[PDB]
Design a protein around this ligand. Structure first.
Ligand SMILES: *[C@@H]1O[C@H](CO)[C@@H](O[C@@H]2O[C@H](CO)[C@@H](O[C@@H]3O[C@H](CO[C@H]4O[C@H](CO)[C@@H](O)[C@H](O)[C@@H]4O)[C@@H](O)[C@H](O[C@H]4O[C@H](CO[C@H]5O[C@H](CO)[C@@H](O)[C@H](O)[C@@H]5O)[C@@H](O)[C@H](O)[C@@H]4O[C@H]4O[C@H](CO)[C@@H](O)[C@H](O)[C@@H]4O)[C@@H]3O)[C@H](O)[C@H]2NC(C)=O)[C@H](O)[C@H]1NC(C)=O
Ligand SMILES: O[C@@H]1[C@@H](O)[C@H](O[C@@H]2CO[C@H](O)[C@H](O)[C@H]2O)OC[C@H]1O
Length: 319
């Protein structure tokens, strides 16, 4: 009957979508977000990030994150909670601080404990650390890495596990979905967290792909199995497939094939628990303001009408 029904029929836990608070006043938008045939899971696109939840040190703000949890709870949708430790969307007090290892570690641990305790029992998964890697697989030189060193990653996981032992703890990144230096380094993050004795349950593969430059079904499936071989689960967490504008029938058809391969790779991999698209309508896509000349990246257009990619997804889910 839809993407989520189709996904569950192949043993996925969900097919879902990100959203953001400003969109929840658009009633036609919210009615389709709340369509559990298509969406069995929601991610808050911004309201659980550090600048939203701890805008001043030790001053926590949960109203906007809680609004998304309440919508998911009313609908019967799962939550993915996103994201605890990330170099982007930090409030000023983190980025401008004069820190020692001790004081930044205490601030990072306090952030994690407070936010994970608030959301205890509400999240299927947390994106505990986001985007810790450079494209060459070396560690991204964020304030956390500069001041604390590599330990910040396992300490973040251990701190989340102490506050909520049940939630799945994910490492989330982009350009780790196909073989290369970064994917190898993401495997090594899994191994490093376990060598420290800390818990990691999942690898989140963002899947911000490009129409006509999407990895093949077989390349995606090799990489999914590469992570599940390590004793973690996997999910595609932020799937969108951006096209060089302007849109044409040919580009929409290529986009459908590209989406179909992503869904089919996850269905073909035991331990791929689901797919989340990074919102569902081109109207609200983050892409056009970030990627010059690119857009129309989602399975519904800016009028909430299905594009061919909706059918490509359904085919990849074996509907
Ligand atoms: C801020 O404060 C915090 C809190 O006090 C400081 O946290 C400490 O951070 C240490 C890392 O900086 C961290 O050490 C690691 O511990 C884990 C766990 O070790 C325990 O368990 C294992 C397994 O049972 C056991 O073998 C150990 O004896 C311990 O009981 C280890 O897995 C880590 O081991 C890796 O790193 C070391 C050190 O690597 C550096 O130095 C070497 C040689 O000098 C150099 O070659 C290397 O390139 C690095 O510069 C290696 O000797 C090991 O072989 C391991 O290396 C593998 O893994 C790395 C990734 O983790 C790869 O990058 C590497 O290529 C290789 O594949 C390591 O010992 C402490 O546990 C942690 N303490 C606490 C209480 O949390 C933090 O340092 C501090 N920050 C600053 C800037 O001051
Ligand atoms: O509204 C946008 C968000 O959609 C965007 O989401 C980011 C994209 O970059 C990373 O992939 C990250 O994991 C996501 O949270 O963040 C910027 C914001 O303006």
């Amino acid at each position: 009957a839809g993407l989520n029904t189709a996904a569950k029929a192949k043993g996925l836990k969900y097919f879902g979508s990100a959203t953001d608070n400003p969109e929840l006043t658009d009633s036609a938008y919210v009615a389709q977000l709340s369509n559990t045939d298509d969406f069995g899971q929601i991610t808050p696109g911004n309201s659980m990030k550090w600048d939203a939840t701890e805008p001043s040190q030790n001053s926590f703000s949960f109203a906007n994150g809680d609004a998304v949890v309440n919508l998911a709870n009313k609908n019967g949708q799962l939550m993915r909670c996103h994201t605890l430790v990330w170099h982007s969307q930090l409030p000023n007090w983190v980025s401008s601080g004069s820190w020692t290892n001790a004081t930044l570690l205490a601030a990072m641990k306090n952030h994690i404990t407070n936010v994970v305790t608030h959301y205890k029992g509400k999240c299927y998964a947390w994106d505990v650390v986001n985007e810790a890697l450079n494209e060459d697989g070396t560690f991204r030189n964020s304030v956390f890495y500069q001041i604390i060193g590599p330990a910040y990653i396992p300490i973040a996981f251990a701190t989340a596990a102490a506050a909520d032992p049940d939630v799945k703890l994910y490492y989330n990144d982009y350009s780790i979905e196909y073989s290369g230096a970064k994917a190898t380094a993401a495997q090594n993050i899994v191994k490093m967290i376990k060598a420290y004795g800390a818990k990691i349950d999942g690898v989140g593969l963002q899947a911000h792909f490009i129409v006509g430059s999407t990895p093949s079904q077989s390349d995606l499936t090799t990489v999914l199995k590469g992570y599940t071989a390590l004793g973690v689960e996997v999910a595609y967490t932020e799937l969108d497939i951006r096209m060089q504008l302007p849109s044409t029938a040919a580009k929409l058809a290529q986009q459908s094939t590209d989406f179909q391969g992503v869904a089919a790779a996850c269905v073909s991999t035991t331990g791929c628990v689901g797919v989340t698209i990074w919102d569902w309508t081109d109207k609200y896509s983050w892409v056009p303001s970030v990627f010059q000349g690119y857009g129309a990246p989602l399975p519904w257009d800016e009028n909430y009408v299905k594009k061919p990619a909706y059918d490509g997804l359904m085919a990849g889910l074996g509907a």
